Amino acid sequence: FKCVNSLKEDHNQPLFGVQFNWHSKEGDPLVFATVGSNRVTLYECHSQGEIRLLQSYVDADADENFYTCAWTYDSNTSHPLLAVAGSRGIIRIINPITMQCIKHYVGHGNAINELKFHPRDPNLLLSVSKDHALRLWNIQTDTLVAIFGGVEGHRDEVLSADYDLLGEKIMSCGMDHSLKLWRINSKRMMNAIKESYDYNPNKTNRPFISQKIHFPDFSTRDIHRNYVDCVRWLGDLILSKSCENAIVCWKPGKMEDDIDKIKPSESNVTILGRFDYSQCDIWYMRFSMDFWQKMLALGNQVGKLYVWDLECTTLTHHKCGAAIRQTSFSRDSSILIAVCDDASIWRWDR
Ligand SMILES: CS(=O)(=O)c1ccc(-c2cnc(NCc3cccc4c3CCO4)n3cnnc23)cc1
Ligand SMILES: [Ca+2]
């Protein structure tokens, strides 16, 4: 990787999220989104390291602080859509063509820390919040499918979640140090997803009833000893990080225990490896994997970019010294984008 370009956003506020759109064709434009302050900005990656600003969405609320964004497509037309949320706990669905807000979802009793679209069903949006719960939305019928939390749910703010390869289960983590598994391929959850597609507030006067999932399918507080701010699946394995300067690769149960044969009572975990690094002991630092899950990338609090081949390397520039909050690889992994606390964007090409 070589640094081929760099730019700073005029608002000067930290950039907390960055996502390439992976739903674009080959030979179609390479687009990425950035979130920070009350803004969502679109960019196009061109030949010889050029970054072209497409458009920005500025939210009406000046005190809204976007923390996350995620890309989806309209199943019927294949046109891209972008979901954004943050400190207001409002989900906004933006039309990237016109950078206009199509619709919004209110529900969470505090800020939204991460947004994730279901890997198979583009209408299924997962939100994680400071209110201790996860929420699964059907953005086609504008319904709240399920609320994950309560009694045996997270006991503090949820910082991250990720679906497995096929979107049969979610793993979430937060300030309570725990990592919780929630199966969505249960009869109850599949009937709720099916039911949510048949709902229309125009054909009934009764509300749609959300599944209230009070108990996870697995839980552990044995991986990390501090806030768990990032979680991602690597097949049936889990990669998670705290602020203890390591990304831990682990799994529920014992060495030969199948994740789908694990009972909720399961008290064992198996650590399969660690990715050690330095100066990334501040809360809110995300790691990211490329489309193929062939590469791992994590930025540190002083502008260093760690990149590991999953089949280490440090990417530095003297002008890059602020905390790198999030990174994103293009679908083909040829480009890696890093976003910083000083509103700066850094482009690294293979
Ligand atoms: C410059 S400062 O004033 O010290 C500061 C620093 C961090 C935050 C902040 C960032 N991010 C989120 N949530 C999203 C999130 C969650 C997990 C990992 C992760 C992210 C974004 C990057 O890595 N926050 C929720 N509440 N505060 C925050 C706000 C102010
Ligand atoms: Ca399985």
Q: How far is CA 133 from the centre of its chain?
A: 15
> Quick one: 107 exposed, middle or buried, by C-beta within 10 A (0-12, 13-18, 19+)?
middle
342 lines ligand 1 (CB under 6 A): no
Contact 178, 219 (CB under 8 A): yes
146 lines ligand 1 (CB under 6 A): no
Distance 152 CA to ligand 2 centre (A): 24
16 lines ligand 1 (CB under 6 A): yes
Contact 143, 128 (CB under 8 A): no
| Placement of tokens 């497509």 in the chain | 73
Query: Residue 87: which of 284, 242, 329 has the closest Cα?
Result: 284
Query: For residue 180, which phi and psi values (nearest 5 degrees)?
Result: -115, 135
Q: Which residues contact 141 (CB under 8 A, 6 or more apart)?
A: 123, 196, 197, 199, 200, 208
Atom 7 of ligand 1: nearest residue by CA position: 284
Q: Tell me the β-bridge partners of 20.
A: 32
Residue type at 174 in one-letter notation: G
Distance 242 CA to ligand 1 centre (A): 13
Contact 290, 284 (CB under 8 A): no
Q: Tell me the β-bridge partners of 251.
A: 270
110 lines ligand 1 (CB under 6 A): no
> What is the experimental method?
X-ray
| Placement of tokens 């010294």 in the chain | 321
Residue type at 309 in one-letter notation: D
Question: How far is residue 80 from each of residues 22, 193, 343, measured CA to CA in Å?
Answer: 10, 22, 25
Distance 258 CA to ligand 2 centre (A): 7
Query: Residue 280: which of 318, 239, 227, 329 has the closest Cα?
Result: 227
CA–CA gap between residue 210 and residue 131 (Å, rounded): 17
Q: Which residues contact 172 (CB under 8 A, 6 or more apart)?
A: 128, 134, 148, 154, 158, 160, 161, 179, 180, 182, 231
**Of 69, 87, 113, 172, best ligand 1 pocket probe by most atoms within 8 Å of the beta carbon:** 113
| Placement of tokens 């984008």 in the chain | 337
CA–CA gap between residue 24 and residue 291 (Å, rounded): 13
CA–CA gap between residue 175 and residue 12 (Å, rounded): 28
Number of residues assigned to the chain:
350
Contact 203, 135 (CB under 8 A): no
Question: How far is residue 195 from each of residues 165, 187, 190, 199, 302, measured CA to CA in Å?
Answer: 23, 12, 8, 7, 48
Atom 13 of ligand 1: nearest residue by CA position: 113
CA–CA gap between residue 336 and residue 324 (Å, rounded): 12
H or E element at residue 296: strand 295-299
CA–CA gap between residue 65 and residue 85 (Å, rounded): 8
Distance 289 CA to ligand 1 centre (A): 19
Query: Residue 281: which of 337, 340, 347, 225 has the closest Cα?
Result: 225
Residue ranges of alpha helices (H) inside the chain are 187-197
Q: What does DSSP assign to residue 278?
A: S
Query: Residue 84: which of 62, 97, 67, 61 has the closest Cα?
Result: 67
Q: To one decimal place, what's the resolution in Å?
A: 2.3
Contact 303, 320 (CB under 8 A): yes
160 lines ligand 1 (CB under 6 A): yes
Q: Which residues contact 199 (CB under 8 A, 6 or more apart)?
A: 141, 143, 208
Distance 256 CA to ligand 2 centre (A): 13
Return the structure tokens found at 189: 């959850």
Q: What does DSSP assign to residue 14?
A: P
Q: In what order do the strands lie in the sheet with 313-315?
A: 287-289, 295-299, 305-309, 313-315
- In this structure, which ligand is nearest to the CA of 340? 1
Atom 14 of ligand 1: nearest residue by CA position: 113
Q: Tell me the β-bridge partners of 313.
A: 307
Residue type at 91 in one-letter notation: I
14 lines ligand 1 (CB under 6 A): yes
**String of DSSP letters for 31-50:** EEEEEETTEEEEEEE-GGG-
